[PDB]
């Protein structure tokens, strides 16, 4: 039926999902990287996000 997904998801954390683990909560949207915080911690070493201070 055509009313399976009637309710919108055009705002809120209904839209925003992580690009790695499909997280909805904790999604840091900044810079348009769309991954959750722990995924960012894990993948910073390999992407090139380096801790200096």
């Amino acid at each position: 039926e055509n009313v399976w997904f009637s309710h919108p998801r055009r705002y809120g954390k209904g839209s925003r999902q992580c690009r790695v683990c499909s997280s909805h909560t904790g999604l840091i949207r900044k810079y348009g990287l769309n991954i959750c915080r722990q995924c960012f911690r894990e993948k910073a070493n390999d992407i090139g996000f380096n801790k200096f201070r």
Binding site: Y31, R37, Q38, F40, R41, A44, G48, N50, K51
Partner: peptide, 23 residues
């Protein structure tokens, strides 16, 4: 400089420690 601050702990526990990933 791009500064992105993130809590170390995946959960809500531990001391309120922080780190700032910089590009």
């Amino acid at each position: 400089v791009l500064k992105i601050s993130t809590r170390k702990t995946p959960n809500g526990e531990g001391s309120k420690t922080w780190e700032t990933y910089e590009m």
